[PDB]
Design a protein around this motif. Structure first.
Motif, PDB file in Angstrom:
ATOM      1  N   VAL A  67       0.798  -1.351   0.020  1.00  0.00           N
ATOM      2  CA  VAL A  67       0.038   0.173  -0.208  1.00  0.00           C
ATOM      3  C   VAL A  67       0.762   1.303  -0.050  1.00  0.00           C
ATOM      4  N   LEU A  68       1.965   1.236   0.918  1.00  0.00           N
ATOM      5  CA  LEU A  68       2.783   2.391   1.053  1.00  0.00           C
ATOM      6  C   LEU A  68       3.618   2.711  -0.323  1.00  0.00           C
ATOM      7  N   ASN A  69       3.841   1.554  -0.967  1.00  0.00           N
ATOM      8  CA  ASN A  69       4.525   1.723  -2.368  1.00  0.00           C
ATOM      9  C   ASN A  69       3.785   2.252  -3.408  1.00  0.00           C
ATOM     10  N   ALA A  70       2.433   1.950  -3.216  1.00  0.00           N
ATOM     11  CA  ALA A  70       1.335   2.253  -4.292  1.00  0.00           C
ATOM     12  C   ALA A  70       0.957   3.794  -4.238  1.00  0.00           C
ATOM     13  N   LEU A  71       0.847   4.275  -2.847  1.00  0.00           N
ATOM     14  CA  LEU A  71       0.629   5.768  -2.493  1.00  0.00           C
ATOM     15  C   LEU A  71       1.441   6.657  -3.069  1.00  0.00           C
TER      16      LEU A  71
END
Ligand SMILES: CC(=O)N[C@@H](CC(C)C)C(=O)N[C@@H](Cc1ccccc1)C(=O)O
Ligand SMILES: CC(=O)N[C@@H](CC(C)C)C(=O)N[C@@H](Cc1ccccc1)C(=O)O
Ligand SMILES: [Ca+2]
Ligand SMILES: [Ca+2]
Ligand SMILES: [Ca+2]
Ligand SMILES: [Ca+2]
Ligand SMILES: [Ca+2]
Ligand SMILES: [Ca+2]
Ligand SMILES: [Ca+2]
Ligand SMILES: [Ca+2]
Ligand SMILES: [Ca+2]
Ligand SMILES: [Ca+2]
Ligand SMILES: [Ca+2]
Ligand SMILES: [Ca+2]
Ligand SMILES: [Cl-]
Lengths: 353, 359
Positions: free
Chosen positions: A315-319
């Motif tokens: 999730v953090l890599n996508a954001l």
């Protein structure tokens, strides 16, 4: 069939469209060379204007070989092509190639279909929608529809949803046109190919069993996936009123370090949330332990909760965010994660025991 | 055992010492102002030294290599990394990041057998890198003839030479190193060649090589690599080089490479044969495959010999052209039943031999 075209006008088309399923259909008709590739589930058609003398006709040739020959030729090469008997001749400078063919009449078509839903949107908006959610698609789930991506129209919004049952991603973007309330599931490979065609607005047409995307001189068509895709509205936590905010890169790197000493299969980490502080812990069967303490913005009640750290890192890599908001309920309930500055995408992750 | 060191001072050493459970650990030793890190797989070993400017306490332990490496890499740039033993664990602390790793005793960390240095020389790193890069691709990989799974290092007069072959194609490179040497050769295992190459940055630190009866050691700056040699007999490259080729073609390396690469598309996928027809200042390359597809390339070259034809494996020729990275290439030809020797047109330092194919 004869045409002569600049290498540089052939490269991108050949890349986009790349036994008979290993071949490309080539058609010279009117002022245009059409190139089609298919795998029976989807197809890509490229049109190239022919400004030099040409002669009509159609054949099929090996896709990879034809592409490799063209891209292997030097910058600025002119590529002369002509069908001679059952071979296709390709000539450029003093380079000559003779490729095998299969009859155009044998090249497979998708069943004919009608467009029911249509809209236009910027390529950038489609890129945003797909990149926001693609990572959350299932891989080889027996629920086949989870292996693809939901595309939903509601109001004037286009929305993508992807989930594997453990984590979910949803992204909604306004497109400024009144849309019917409708949803379709695009297969994994279709999502990949749709993304790959985004270098010009995008025109989308949706039928009962198909989706089509027109961008520039390319037309992509895919079959849709049958099934009951879950409703993200029933997955978003009802009242996740514990709100923690933190730096995205800071939080990501802390989780990434803790992950090193997490169980290699189950990847569990524990979060301890307190007044303006987050503690992340990890341990493995070797009794090795990691601990990270981070300053955050949090003025809610203390709680602890466990997660698969890979899902959180995903999730953090996508954001690709500056700050992130984590929205919590309790130790045995899912968490919602968003960019602190945008509500346009949301992520839901199951807790671990 | 205690030390505190900047992250970046550990990264290169950790890269170098990384590749029975303890073989997956690094030996750490604090002694006389220095942290030493050692990795080994029993065949070869790398030791890296790091100077300790901050307070430290002596001792030794071993720690999981990949985990320790990943922790250090994952900490922020410039981070101070404090390490201490605590019972059977190693504590690693930096800022408010804390880790406790398992250890295995330093007493159990294996050593290579003791040995004596018999042949030694010093050369610039860039020279050793040139010698290995020129030939590495021609080593065998997992051949039954175990002595080919490596690289010959030969000293003769004032030159150092490498030879690599897989029984099908051969590469040789020779460089003068300005020291009177004994005539000697040894075989370094391929994994050791790869590890040696990775240790060299081509920098200003001299490379010192020591060769024993069964070992080789390479020392550059803070790093010492030691490997076992392959205990076997290597073939004689002088018998492989085609004797006095009478024909010589010269061409632009990139133009020739791109012609072969396009022709290769329509060559046999398993045996990769292409044919050359050489005539006055002209080369024609042809390829065909079992599906009867055909490629032809004609290009201008410099050639004034008799007309002739020859076939060869285009993968092997492409490998040579990619290794040469040259402006111009020379192909030394004899006839359709003899090997070809290929070199940079402007350097005799490296030579490559490819066999003929009858197509
Ligand atoms: C295991 C579980 O409870 N998962 C929930 C979704 C996650 C929080 C992302 C959930 O609501 N699962 C439901 C509905 C569902 C089904 C398939 C894929 C996603 C969500 C369920 O398992 O039936
Ligand atoms: C098959 C063949 O003849 N190979 C020759 C070497 C190539 C041209 C690189 C050759 O001379 N083979 C000899 C010697 C040899 C043995 C092992 C490895 C390289 C060369 C042979 O097979 O005995
Ligand atoms: Ca043109
Ligand atoms: Ca031809
Ligand atoms: Ca209507
Ligand atoms: Ca701890
Ligand atoms: Ca939304
Ligand atoms: Ca080692
Ligand atoms: Ca920092
Ligand atoms: Ca020692
Ligand atoms: Ca000596
Ligand atoms: Ca000599
Ligand atoms: Ca020769
Ligand atoms: Ca003969
Ligand atoms: Cl232990």
């Amino acid at each position: 069939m004869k045409f002569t075209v600049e290498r540089e006008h052939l490269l991108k088309p050949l890349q986009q469209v790349s036994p008979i399923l290993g071949n490309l259909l080539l058609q010279v008709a009117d002022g245009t060379l059409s190139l089609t590739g298919t795998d029976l589930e989807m197809e890509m058609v490229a049109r190239v204007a022919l400004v030099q003398p040409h002669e009509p006709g159609a054949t099929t040739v090996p896709a990879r070989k034809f592409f490799d020959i063209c891209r292997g030729l030097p910058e600025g090469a002119e590529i002369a092509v002509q069908l001679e008997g059952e071979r296709m001749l390709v000539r450029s400078g003093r380079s000559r190639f003779s490729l095998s063919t299969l009859p155009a009449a044998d090249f497979p078509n998708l069943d004919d279909w009608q467009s029911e839903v249509e809209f236009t949107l910027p390529q950038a908006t489609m890129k945003r929608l797909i990149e926001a959610t693609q990572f959350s698609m299932a891989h080889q789930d027996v629920r086949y529809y989870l292996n693809g991506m939901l595309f939903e129209t509601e109001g004037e919004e286009l929305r993508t949803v992807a989930t594997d049952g453990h984590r979910l991603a949803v992204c909604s973007m306004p497109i400024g046109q009144s849309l019917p309330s409708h949803s379709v599931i695009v297969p994994r490979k279709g999502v990949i190919e749709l993304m790959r065609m985004l270098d010009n607005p995008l025109r989308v047409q949706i039928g009962s069993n198909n989706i089509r995307a027109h961008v520039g001189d390319f037309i992509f068509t895919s079959k849709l996936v049958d099934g009951r895709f879950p409703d993200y509205r029933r997955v978003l936590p009802k009242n996740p009123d514990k709100h923690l905010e933190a730096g995205c890169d800071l939080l990501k790197q802390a989780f990434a370090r803790a992950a090193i000493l997490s169980n290699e299969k189950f990847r569990g980490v524990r979060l301890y949330v307190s007044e303006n502080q987050l503690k992340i812990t990890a341990n493995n069967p070797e009794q090795e332990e990691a601990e990270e303490i981070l300053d955050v913005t949090y003025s809610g009640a203390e709680m602890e909760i466990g997660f698969n750290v890979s899902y959180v890192l995903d999730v953090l890599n996508a954001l690709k965010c500056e700050n992130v908001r984590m929205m919590l309920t309790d130790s045995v309930s899912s968490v919602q994660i968003e960019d602190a500055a945008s509500q346009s995408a949301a992520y839901v992750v199951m807790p671990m025991r």
